[PDB]
Design an enzyme around this catalytic site. Structure first.
Site, PDB file in Angstrom:
ATOM      1  N   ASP A 274       0.857  -1.178   0.000  1.00  7.78           N
ATOM      2  CA  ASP A 274       0.000   0.000   0.000  1.00  7.78           C
ATOM      3  C   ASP A 274       0.892   1.226   0.000  1.00  7.78           C
ATOM      4  O   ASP A 274       2.001   1.188   0.540  1.00  7.78           O
ATOM      5  CB  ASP A 274      -0.857   0.094   1.276  1.00  7.78           C
ATOM      6  CG  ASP A 274      -0.053   0.567   2.488  1.00  7.78           C
ATOM      7  OD1 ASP A 274       0.585  -0.280   3.155  1.00  7.78           O
ATOM      8  OD2 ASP A 274      -0.048   1.780   2.749  1.00  7.78           O
TER       9      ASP A 274
ATOM     10  N   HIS B 219      -6.111   7.353 -13.269  1.00  2.00           N
ATOM     11  CA  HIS B 219      -5.042   6.811 -14.090  1.00  2.00           C
ATOM     12  C   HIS B 219      -3.943   6.184 -13.229  1.00  2.00           C
ATOM     13  O   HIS B 219      -3.459   5.087 -13.520  1.00  2.00           O
ATOM     14  CB  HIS B 219      -4.436   7.868 -15.013  1.00  2.00           C
ATOM     15  CG  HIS B 219      -3.134   7.412 -15.567  1.00  2.00           C
ATOM     16  ND1 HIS B 219      -3.033   6.493 -16.591  1.00  2.00           N
ATOM     17  CD2 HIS B 219      -1.878   7.629 -15.115  1.00  2.00           C
ATOM     18  CE1 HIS B 219      -1.749   6.214 -16.775  1.00  2.00           C
ATOM     19  NE2 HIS B 219      -1.034   6.883 -15.887  1.00  2.00           N
TER      20      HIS B 219
HETATM   21 ZN   LIG Z   1      -4.382   5.611 -17.973  1.00  3.65          ZN
END
Ligand SMILES: [Zn+2]
Ligand SMILES: [Cl-]
Ligand SMILES: [Cl-]
Ligand SMILES: [Zn+2]
Lengths: 372, 372
Positions: free
Chosen positions: B269, B338
């Site tokens: 993490d 993203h």
């Molecule tokens: Zn992406």
């Protein structure tokens, strides 16, 4: 049949009427707009805190693109080089752009209004405004005008209205002189005249002589109060051509919208659902609530008990209260989606009630509950 | 067949191995976790700027819930009263919670560590930490420990490791004494000992005697540099039980993850993809980029040329550059989606390459391109 087997540049059709209220559609090359319509505001090539697909999921058919921020950054020419605003931000449906002039006056420094337009710390003329809107790829272009403060004396209101009408002709001619714009976009004119019936009439007559695809009522989102706004709408909207859309710029609260539709308005925009959503105000059928209030800290109900939006299907008041108090981005996202969905559901109820000849009853029921 | 026609509390299975690297699954009552796994961090009951459905769309199987913020606001008892963290935030899959102790030390004031736990401006004991994690409804509970700063002298590292092992037994007994927690959640122990092999060995032996469902390598996300982190992992991971998951807390950059998997780590993490995404850093197969740089202002390519995420399907670098420079919420949303998607695609490539016996080649190819 073979004979039965693209959309026009612009076609406004009225399907039903009740009193001064109308419901119908505007067909354009990028999509159909159901009227009366509410346009979420995209301030800097984004409806704040929402992906375009989420804007569409709320029911919006068209968004308003503010021009002022984009003409400064990234710049109109740059947006055009990148493929236009629709491609840039990922919204493929109609966009109405403002002229930039009002936000110059409200947000810029060292401003100067003149017969050439407005200079600020850069010059924005009528011709340049139309060009900027072209470079962005606007579907509905607003004529460039000169704003009138409120209150305004009759002399000042007349001067700015008269200049605005000269600028309306310049805007018309600039739009028409750009073939790609004239063939693919629409141009709306803006009625001015402050609160004065005679000036509103002169302005409507000037705009009708020039000829536009739609007619905005300008100068009424300026602090005058609802009674006065409605009084001005009472005489101003009938002055506009009946067979074209009527756009009340910058309005407004839910009850403002209902009363404006009762007075013949077809289109609306304002930042209230987005901006006040981020600030913690949620719209409900029982009136607005401020979700930051401690009374919501353990409230497991959705923001609104009837709302069909994804936020109200999935999250509680208690959770959204926590997010907004914590300054979390998801709080802004959820409040904004709900508020824009609420506005679209209001517009849908308006359209359906006019279509069914029961809008007067809807307006009375809406007010009784919203102001309880 | 009739005989062929619920998931266990906890089952870790290893499907394939290459060197020290492993790939497999953890089955739990709320879902399956594919390993090696990356856990996005939810700081205050939200993975910042993402709806849970978007977190899931990136491929995440489990998220990390920080405890410290939630124990202060809304409070653990309040979250329990509202139905638990999963319901509250709308994430129905496994959640691993930290103990709260590390963020007390990093974010609170007037702290005091003792044999009773930590007090701060409130007391957090081992027993209370386990209870808080229970009230949140954690699926993987972390034992409460005492952190060791870096650098640490051998004496200090030994003292905090020894206290942490006493706290590990207290955590075990507290967890086991709560029937609903013991039957439905899992408990991980944390190896300490700073950079010292003998202390790491003593800690691993103490934890194995107590017995846990998984074993974290604590104390290595603390500024020591990758060479030193890898050196410590080289000797520390083999000390842990082979048949249980190995969790490297707080790590890390993409190349840290790859090298840690090469050394036997199964779970990770960190806040890097979320926090640095909001700050303008995007991860790509060719290394990180800062999207605010002027070189991106007219770049129509997606953030990464191969990435399968929704952001890279729909928006350009130029648009995201504009949003981040403008301070727009949508910029944070898109960068974060993203980056978390990139991390999940990295984990998928790791899992597939181990499953196919080509992870060593993947690691070499990954590094050659990422650091080109
Ligand atoms: Zn992406
Ligand atoms: Cl806004
Ligand atoms: Cl974060
Ligand atoms: Zn809603």
């Amino acid at each position: 049949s073979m004979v039965e087997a693209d959309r026009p540049r612009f076609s406004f059709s009225i399907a039903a009427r009740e009193g001064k209220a109308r419901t119908g559609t505007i067909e354009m090359k990028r999509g159909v707009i159901r009227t009366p319509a509410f346009m979420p505001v995209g301030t800097a090539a984004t409806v704040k805190a929402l992906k375009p697909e989420t804007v569409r999921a709320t029911g919006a058919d068209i968004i308003l693109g503010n021009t002022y921020h984009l003409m400064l950054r990234p710049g109109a020419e740059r947006i055009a080089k990148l493929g236009g605003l629709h491609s840039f931000m990922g919204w493929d449906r109609p966009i109405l752009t403002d002229s930039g002039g009002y936000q110059v006056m409200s947000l810029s420094s060292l401003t100067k209004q003149s017969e050439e337009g407005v200079t600020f710390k850069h010059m924005l003329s009528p011709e340049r405004s139309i060009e900027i809107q072209h470079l962005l790829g606007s579907d509905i272009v607003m004529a460039f005008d000169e704003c009138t403060p409120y209150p305004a004396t009759p002399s000042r209101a007349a001067s700015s209205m008269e200049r605005s009408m000269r600028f309306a002709k310049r805007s018309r001619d600039a739009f028409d002189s750009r073939k790609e714009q004239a063939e693919n976009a629409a141009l709306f004119g803006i009625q001015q005249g402050s609160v004065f019936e005679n000036l509103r009439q002169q302005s409507a007559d000037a705009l009708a002589e020039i000829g536009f695809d739609g007619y905005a009522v300008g100068g009424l989102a300026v602090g005058e109060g609802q009674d006065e706004m409605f009084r001005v709408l009472d005489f101003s909207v009938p002055m506009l051509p009946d067979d074209k859309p009527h756009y009340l710029m910058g309005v407004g609260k839910p009850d403002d919208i209902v009363g404006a539709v009762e007075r013949g308005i077809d289109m609306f925009d304002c930042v209230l659902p987005t901006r006040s959503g981020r600030n913690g105000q949620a719209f409900t059928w029982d009136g607005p609530i401020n979700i930051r209030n401690a009374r919501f800290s353990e409230d497991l109900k959705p923001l609104d008990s009837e709302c069909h939006c994804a936020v109200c299907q999935k999250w509680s008041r208690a959770y959204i209260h926590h997010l907004i108090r914590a300054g979390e981005i998801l709080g802004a996202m959820l409040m904004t989606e709900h508020n824009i969905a609420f506005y679209q559901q209001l517009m849908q109820k308006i359209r359906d009630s006019i279509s069914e000849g029961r809008f007067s009853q809807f307006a009375q029921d809406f007010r009784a509950r919203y102001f309880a």
